[PDB]
Symmetry: C3
Subunit: 475 residues, 3 copies
């Protein structure tokens, strides 16, 4: 039986942010969401999140996550950030007085911590009958971590904080993860003995190690070799470092599953994204939120998609797109903008300098060039001519437009919504369509061409164009 406490009530001042630290994101989830997902998978009997100033801004997000993960998550409040040891005291207050399960503690700023690591911790703690088991790792750069102090026979004696450590203790590269398992009576007893006479004037959870050792209680350190899983994030430098590591792991998982990622270093993939076999992702690409890409696609370079579904065999190149679907075999890009509600059918095409918003575009239909399609429904196997605009907006209002199948509209056509263009209709180049066009009708509005002979000689006399028409006249 285990209760897990997540300490998320510190001020987060080193982030230098007006957004609460635990709400900063990597790979499409906040640090707090990563931590609560990992813990939820372990499925402890109790899950308590300690929150501080704000709490009004974080507790709702906690309750949404409890619903998503299908379990209750209690919030305990810590009124002032008196230190990690005091935050654990506040967390214990959400437990019955008589609670007898183990207590696991972790921080809200260790976002790569996983279920397996927690399960190993609990298993080790139970096996050695420890009063306290602390996860540790070894780092090239241990700055800012609590240093593990061992006796000559390698017994863990104490954890010393960066601010409290001597220059010589600072050289210690074995560090405290800040993930612990405790015997609850031993934890309560040690917490009642903390004092705050240290460099930060705080009540440090870390002092419990030395306090329990004082009592001749069993103190066990469990070394996590994969240091990233317990790396902490106190500032934005560490956040981006850990985001980069998580992203390499996500990309690698896709590569081992059959996805070619040309340049993992410049390919950002959020945790919920799925990608089919033999897709190729080119450099400079981000796949974000719940994007799903099918098999044998080509995506990128320089593509950003958030919540976009892409079928099999599609090409989505130099495209910026959100909340849209792209059908099997469709071709999007280069230089294409998809705004929410865009649905392009199979074997559709949206080409360069095209923007679509809130429009459905049927199977095999092509909008190849320099056009804006807004609030419109277009049928199958139609062709929209270059440099056209679906005019939704009359200065105050916005309306719908329907274009049928096998239509061929001429370049530079403006469709002033709402209008209906019937199946197989055409429009001339340069048409302003303000009324319905029957099936198989040709709609036109451009006036006839008139040539004004020798205009250039008269109105641009002695210009390079005048000399040129003169020169062409002679030869």
């Amino acid at each position: 039986d285990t209760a897990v406490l997540v300490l998320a009530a510190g001020p987060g001042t080193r982030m230098r942010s007006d957004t609460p630290k635990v709400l900063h994101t990597l790979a499409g989830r906040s640090m707090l969401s990563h931590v609560l997902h990992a813990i939820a998978k372990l499925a402890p009997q109790r899950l308590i999140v300690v929150l501080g100033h704000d709490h009004q801004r974080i507790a709702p997000l906690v309750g949404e996550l409890a619903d998503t993960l299908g379990r209750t998550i209690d919030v305990a409040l810590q009124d002032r950030p008196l230190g990690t040891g005091h935050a654990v005291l506040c967390g214990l207050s959400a437990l019955p007085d008589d609670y007898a399960g183990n207590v696991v503690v972790t921080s809200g700023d260790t976002p790569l911590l996983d279920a397996d690591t927690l399960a190993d911790l609990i298993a080790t703690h139970r096996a050695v009958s420890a009063a306290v088991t602390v996860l540790t790792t070894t780092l090239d750069d241990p700055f800012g971590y609590g240093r593990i102090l061992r006796t000559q026979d390698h017994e863990v004696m104490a954890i010393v904080e960066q601010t409290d450590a001597t220059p010589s203790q600072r050289e210690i590269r074995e560090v405290n993860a800040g993930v612990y398992a405790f015997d609850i009576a031993a934890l309560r007893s040690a917490l009642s003995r903390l004092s705050s006479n240290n460099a930060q004037q705080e009540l440090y959870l870390t002092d419990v190690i030395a306090i329990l050792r004082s009592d001749g209680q069993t103190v066990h350190a469990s070394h996590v070799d994969d240091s990233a899983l317990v790396a902490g994030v106190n500032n934005r430098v560490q956040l981006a470092e850990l985001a980069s590591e998580l992203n390499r792991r996500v990309v690698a998982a896709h590569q081992l599953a059959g996805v070619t990622v040309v340049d993992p270093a410049t390919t950002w993939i959020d945790v919920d994204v799925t990608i089919g076999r033999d897709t190729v992702i080119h450099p400079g690409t981000q796949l974000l939120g719940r994007t799903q890409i099918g098999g044998r696609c080509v995506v990128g370079p320089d593509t950003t998609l958030t919540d976009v579904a892409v079928g099999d065999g599609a090409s989505v190149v130099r495209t910026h797109g959100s909340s849209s679907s792209i059908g099997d075999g469709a071709a999007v890009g280069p230089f294409t903008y998809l705004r929410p509600g865009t649905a392009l059918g199979a074997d559709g095409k949206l080409g360069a300098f095209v923007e679509v918003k809130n429009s459905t575009i049927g199977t095999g239909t092509k909008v190849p060039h320099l056009t804006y399609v807004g609030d419109a429904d277009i049928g199958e196997y139609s062709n929209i001519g270059a440099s056209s605009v679906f005019v939704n907006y009359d200065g105050t209002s916005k309306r719908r437009t329907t274009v049928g199948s096998h239509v061929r509209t001429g370049s530079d056509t403006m469709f002033v919504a709402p209008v209906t263009i019937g199946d197989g209709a055409y429009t001339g180049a340069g048409t302003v369509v303000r009324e319905d066009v029957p099936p198989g009708a040709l709609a036109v509005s451009a006036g006839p061409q008139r040539n004004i002979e020798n205009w250039v000689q008269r109105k641009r006399p002695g210009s390079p164009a005048a000399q040129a028409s003169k020169r062409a006249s002679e030869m």
Copy 2:
């Protein structure tokens, strides 16, 4: 006298691909092409590629490469992938029974192997009179490689595979490259003694080392310090790692030759690309296939060019382009798409939101804005006005259009192919050109402007525009 065998008949299952492993690419060539280029330069008397299931999909590519490299390359078939030792047996079958040259063996998945490394191997093998000389290297991460086992006086005893090695042998960081030279009689004798009682149930080439040592035959290991040259690719993670290393080497060669590459990490350059002195390449750029860039150019950021020739002093910025030429001093981008058959003359300009396909554009001509130029020939020193379209396609058909020199066409002109615009002609803004325009003529079609006074007060009563025309009326 030497025969080289390339083993390329394994299933490649760890790639999780429907494309044969040896056909996956880096820096513009398949792994197999890289390996056969390296070997061809060494110029052995015989070159035999062992192929498996598929072979129908790979052998043609081999024959194309034989023609390109100007030499014969024999294919030997291995019907089932019974292991590397069996693949060598199959390869030997393409040699005469009485063959007496050395036999060199390498894999199709070691794509950075170079001619010099092979020549050193053969030279070392001949010098020590070895029965077998095996290339080895030392790696931080030796996962998946055969481990080199040495006696106490550092004699090579055996190679143990990742799957067959003990936890303690797995700690060995000296690894088998899988590149060997053999005395042929000794190779044939050892291969006849292989058995498949191991963790993979395969006939391992690697066992020949221990078998030859058994016979008191000379076994020599030659350590390659530059580990990348013998790194292998069994999955897409390793493929992208080795692609990134190869790319750093290609970029570095350009930098040492006089090319500024601002960010090598985000600048991908294929092996056949050439780049002139004092060109600057900005981040996020890929130069692919047979692209050639001249001297003093500026390329990028965010440019992708495949088979594009760019002259000296040109700027090609945020451009996506293929099978096109860009003249000396020309300016392309930002946000410009070049499709195949685009030829832009010296001091030409193709600006933002411009797409060109299959068009020739003469010296000094500018197409600066929001325009599509398809299937058209344009002369010298002409100016195409913003937001124009060369309409090639009439719904069923596509035709040509010719525009002369020193022409100035007005914004929003549509050129309905085929039409000819003579030298020094002009078009008005908003013209639809459906007929020829003589030299120095002005072609027009837009109707006259009419102002409807107080329309906004009548039809948008109490709108912010109505209040504003009211307010401007008073003051």
Copy 3:
């Protein structure tokens, strides 16, 4: 009292450039500017730059920097590049014969050298009463650096150049920074004893170490642990390596100050750029020259801005822009090009496939799609319809256009400069505006739509459009 000499008169042949080596840039400044900024902050009594062939191309840049930094900087000429020791001789020639201050020497190709490092050097030199104090560091790859030779009790004996060192001395990883402090009499005495019998046939400054040791003079080495601060740049590979390191440091400083930089590896920030709290920078972004970004902005991905000011809460996404201002809360991108002189007001919008040049755009005004705005002034809360062009240029000439506030212009409107559009006016879709439009007028020019019934059956008989109008006719 101290005089600093910067040696910048070598040929720079390893750069393979027609641009003088010390003029190559990183993070928005030349190597020479970085070095003179660092030295200027230290504020020595004398600052002398030794220049060579060229000097005509570099000395003006030196004088501009002297004015900027508010101090004199003397140029000494070295006619031929006879070596670093000869360049110091030439530099001393700009000092009085009787000069008694310390002499500090550094190269023009050590561009991360900082004021603190120089101040520590001078402080150490004075403390130990050294004749010569040389800065050293230790490197994994010491190729091309002078190697530090020490006796058995760790006394510095000599510096040996890469070209002159034995294979075994080349293994030495402690290297000469080429930054020194000297007692001036001891320096002059040692320089008069240099000879050029070495591998480069040059007069090496580095020999002064052994010469002074000969005289039993005090020689002190001061180890700089942060090796980047004294890394040198002899070729473009080293230049990009040091640019990447400097850039990581600049980015890190922003992150610690409150800026989220999602991907430091692909975010290039020049030294003079400022960025406000809680701004987020997305991958693939360069912020260059004197760009200033306010707080809570979103910038990128794939954005390049040079000398662009962006207010607070603005979004500037996939934008390529220079010498422009973007107001508070404004939205720019994706796929937007800003040319110099663009000023967008607060809560303005410039959307996809929009280019602006030399135009002012007032508070709350939107230019959302496919439009070019050149040489124009637009008022507040106006809306420019999609696919429009401000036509500045009549084939020979360019003029102004003024658009008032609360105007709503129709899609596909061409504004033939110069024209004035009054407050609250409208234009129809497809209008060519060649004359002034009063406040609250509606300007139009497009002809009426005509539908030609059954045109497709007659002129595209048996086409998929004809069959479709037939099929829609029946059902």
